[PDB]
Amino acid sequence: AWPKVQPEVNIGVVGHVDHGKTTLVQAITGIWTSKKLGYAETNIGVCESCKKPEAYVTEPSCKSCGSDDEPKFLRRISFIDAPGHEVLMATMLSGAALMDGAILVVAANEPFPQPQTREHFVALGIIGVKNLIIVQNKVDVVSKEEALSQYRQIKQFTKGTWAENVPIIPVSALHKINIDSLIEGIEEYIKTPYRDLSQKPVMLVIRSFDVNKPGTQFNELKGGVIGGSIIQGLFKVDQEIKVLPGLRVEKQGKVSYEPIFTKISSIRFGDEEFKEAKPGGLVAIGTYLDPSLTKADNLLGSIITLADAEVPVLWNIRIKYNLLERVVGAKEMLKVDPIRAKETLMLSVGSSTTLGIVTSVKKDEIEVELRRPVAVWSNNIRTVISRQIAGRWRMIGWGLVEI
């Protein structure tokens, strides 16, 4: 049979709203994710007797190509499908911190390139998720020649760009057409990255919940669960951990943050239990925390490390920054203005997003006073910078958080 193992790689699914991201994930995994960020897993195998791409399978069966032989197991993979709506760009940025590679979904029956087609694309480039496949979705609704016409636009768009040789794979997610070619492309272009498991364990938090059913007996109350993805190193059951920045405290008009210390009581990927958690997949860390602390994604944006790790938790940061020429996600083309002092910016760092006031601007560096602190677990940490333009937070640049 096939091993029951954790997913070993995270594939983002991004692109403009309604282009078919969620349907594409369902086409691949059989799972419909109504949750955003959405999440789903599948095993991937190959029938070694049969010809490709239909040799690739997402279940342990080669019936569809003749064999009663079991297909060779290749790996378990995970999809993170980001929301496409322009107002949800911050959520796309959080999710991108979790991605090892991405699929950019482009609807074949809409004029390319749409605003979030562009914004998601450049966001991926900035944060370095460059193992990209471009998927031309909804080909079922246009003629071959119309699809090809857009194909050459996509090629024109990526030319002269880091994505110049990114593959473009046409499919119908809704009617499940040419999905085998996408799976073959996933194996070819989105390899599982090398993981240095000696690095200090860091997990980025995107969810937290109280898993207790209603009216549950108080002696019966399970501890809080925290969901996210392990970004480096690995965690084990019964490891002493902390959540950073942690818990916000009133005290009584002056707000501060206190690290939350706890212990890993259980580890879970999907519905399977494990003893360890490594990079790849969305992990649910069980803890001894009061469920009231982890209710309703309360800890989104936090990180988790071992209890004794040294981690700066900063209310002021220095960023070595670069601005985009123009505001890519806007409908109307707009040039980005230089950072000005005393202007509030939105910073995405890991899975967190937080507002700050610019206290210093230089050609290559800004300093900002944060409304809430961020945990900075490493020296070269990419941040994405957004400005409120048009009543809406728009990506305008990026930087390195300098410590």
Ligand SMILES: Nc1nc2c(ncn2[C@@H]2O[C@H](COP(=O)(O)OP(=O)(O)O)[C@@H](O)[C@H]2O)c(=O)[nH]1
């Ligand atoms: N005709 C056709 N419709 C599709 C395809 N994929 C998605 N859709 C439809 O497009 C709409 C938006 O799909 P959805 O996956 O929710 O888009 P998302 O916002 O990017 O996640 C839904 O009505 C889908 O049924 C496709 O391959 N062909």
Ligand SMILES: Nc1nc2c(ncn2[C@@H]2O[C@H](COP(=O)(O)O)[C@@H](O)[C@H]2O)c(=O)[nH]1
């Ligand atoms: N590690 C761990 N995860 C749990 C436990 N109970 C629920 N989860 C996880 O928490 C999430 C929400 O579960 P639900 O509240 O829908 O039952 C799921 O990802 C599930 O796997 C648990 O006892 N230990």
Ligand SMILES: [Mg+2]
């Ligand atoms: Mg969706």
Ligand SMILES: [Mg+2]
């Ligand atoms: Mg499957």
Ligand SMILES: [Mg+2]
């Ligand atoms: Mg197949």
Ligand SMILES: [Mg+2]
């Ligand atoms: Mg990555």
Ligand SMILES: [Mg+2]
């Ligand atoms: Mg067609």
